[PDB]
A paper describes a structure:
Candida boidinii NAD+-dependent formate dehydrogenase (CbFDH) is a homodimeric 82 kDa enzyme complex that catalyzes the reversible conversion of formate and carbon dioxide using NAD+/NADH coenzymes for electron transfer. Candida boidinii NAD+-dependent formate dehydrogenase (CbFDH) has gained significant attention for its potential application in the production of biofuels and various industrial chemicals from inorganic carbon dioxide. Here, we present high-resolution crystal structures of apo CbFDH determined at cryogenic and ambient temperatures, as well as as that of the highly active Val120Thr mutant of CbFDH at cryogenic temperature. The inherent capability of the enzyme to catalyze the conversion of CO2 to formate holds significant potential for reducing atmospheric CO2 levels.
Studying protein structures at ambient temperature offers valuable insights into their natural conformational dynamics, active-site flexibility, functional mechanisms and binding behavior. Therefore, in addition to the structure obtained at cryogenic temperature, we also determined the structure of wild-type CbFDH at ambient temperature. 97.66% of the residues were in the favored regions, while 2.34% were in the allowed regions, with no outliers according to the Ramachandran statistics. Comparison of the wild-type structures determined at cryogenic and ambient temperatures showed that the structure did not significantly change due to temperature except for flexible loops and large amino-acid side chains. The reason might be that flash-cooling in liquid nitrogen captured the protein in its most stable state in solution, which we also observed in the ambient temperature structure. The cryogenic temperature structure exhibited a significantly higher number of identified water molecules, with 2179 waters resolved, compared with the ambient temperature structure with only 393 water molecules. The higher resolution achieved at cryogenic temperatures significantly improves the accuracy of identifying water molecules compared with the ambient temperature structures at lower resolution. Another reason for the different numbers of identified water molecules could be the differences in water accessibility and occupancy between the two conditions. At cryogenic temperatures water molecules might be frozen at specific binding sites, leading to the stabilization of interactions that are transient at ambient temperature.
Residue numbers in the entry:
A (entry chain B): 1 to 353
B (entry chain A): 1 to 356
Write the structure that this text describes.
Amino acid sequence: MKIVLVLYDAGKHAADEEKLYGCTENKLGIANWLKDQGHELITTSDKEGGNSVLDQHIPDADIIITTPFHPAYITKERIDKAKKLKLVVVAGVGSDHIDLDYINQTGKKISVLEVTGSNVVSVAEHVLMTMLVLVRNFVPAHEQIINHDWEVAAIAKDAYDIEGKTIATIGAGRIGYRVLERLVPFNPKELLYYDYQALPKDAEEKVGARRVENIEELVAQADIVTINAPLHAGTKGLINKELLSKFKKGAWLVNTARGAICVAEDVAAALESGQLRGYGGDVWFPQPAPKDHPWRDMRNKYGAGNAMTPHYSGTTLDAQTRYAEGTKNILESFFTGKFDYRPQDIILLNGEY
Amino acid sequence: MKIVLVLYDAGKHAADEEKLYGCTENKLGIANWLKDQGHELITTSDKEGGNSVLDQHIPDADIIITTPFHPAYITKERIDKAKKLKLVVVAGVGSDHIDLDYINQTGKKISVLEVTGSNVVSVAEHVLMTMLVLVRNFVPAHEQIINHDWEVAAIAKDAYDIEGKTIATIGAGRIGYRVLERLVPFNPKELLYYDYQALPKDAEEKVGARRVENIEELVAQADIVTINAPLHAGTKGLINKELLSKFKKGAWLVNTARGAICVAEDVAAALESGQLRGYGGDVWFPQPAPKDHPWRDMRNKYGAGNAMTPHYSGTTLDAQTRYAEGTKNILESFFTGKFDYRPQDIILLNGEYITK
């Protein structure tokens, strides 16, 4: 079979770190395994334009492997020309870039699977780190040192302990709950959550969480808000100026789910005006963020309150090992004809939900 | 009575934030309380030199109040001239700037107290933050964004999850144990500790810690090492070229206890050579850190691995409230003649140690 694998070029960075599996130069660490079975692997990062390498091999590709960190868009046109396509794998979590609805609508026997759960711990750690960095005012603290200054009172005037604060998550799924687990020993005043379905009673009691019924009430009483909910019609532009004015004055806000859940200019305005004390996360809209994206230069009144990073929380070396191993398990189930997929990994089974 | 209060000057920042109690401008929020009680308060940051404000009022001061973040050194020479000194207070935790030995050995009747426990959570949170920052390679990640760059592979190649890592602490006291308590739900591979005495069996089971008899074996197997021990003859210069050579290759190291526990240039050389992946903390020697202190500019081979900050982990606004309240409670015990101090706050009571 012909496998096409779309990843980013890591350049010289690939050669320093051989554990960096998710690049074109290291090919998820499965290139030899695919060769041993007897299979043709096409690896490329060129995914844009009609004449791209990806489009030259789509007509006869049996399998396409993509990643959310260099996402090849599987469009209606591309699916039309994919005569032999049987399986699409996301080496990671996230299928925004796949036209799932059209595949289902045409009747083609195409399976779409992802490595469910490979990213949850990585992202949840990123949230807590981001929380601590913002609350404890770490960014200006470190900037002082490498600028060769020493002025504690400039740092301490906006520095707080995370102990004794009310922390709220919008969304209590895999990521949001594991965030709540890690906050317990820090002794928050209260842990709150809002979601479209209740946490199981036993899960709720393990973390001492309280469910709030509507979002305006949740953010009104929370010192810290973290966004851990999927992007659909209900959450698109959810964080706009009207809701932000309902936030506790001087709150902290973390978002690692999807940049489009926020209105970029409203968040920046709130940080400048003081409605927010800090904003941090690793998701942007548009993504990758242009040089002019307002979230790059936004700062609270003190020149701080920005804990932004590129989209890498889920591409740590430990997560990549899980992506590579999960992709191998998925291909194994498909090559052998067993189709013994993990149920949580199936997005579409032969064109069906 | 006369009280001398020695804090740093916060300048404009005091105006920005009324809750910034630990500066000369806001005087721990007790100035009006002391005035009503009819005492004389002296507030100064001038603490060095023989004609400083501190030395001008030492001869007849009844009480001196200090902070570790702008320490006035209660030396033998200064103790000899304090004719009326009865009480020395640490608005915070830390007594290295006080000559406790001279007081206890002479027998002068001076009580020394500190606000015990008021810094523990603040410091422990700072330790977890630094660990996640270094392990997840956050500093180069952020510098990319504010420099208007976007290159994920340059960050991802040295970024890790703290899950499944081996974490060890040198010292399992109040702060050391707190760090372990908060690490448990991050699912480390194993938690280790080294100390001159063992934790109680229950304390060990709660965090699932395993004791390691000698440091050389502790560091050799640890992905992450954090120092939470006091500075004494056994820990001064502990982290040096010899011991660092026996760390696990590519180790992360965090220190929020005392700068002198490390040899500054041995650490920098270890970081530059690849022995350490990163180093972080808020404690320095000398402190405040000179502009050319090597720890400011050191970086790992990728230009990352530095998570240093000024000495501020225990002076967050939450902690300063605890420091300010505790000082007021201590003075109230002294002024009323009750001397009903919290037992854990006493370092020396009338020049004598007490059962702990």
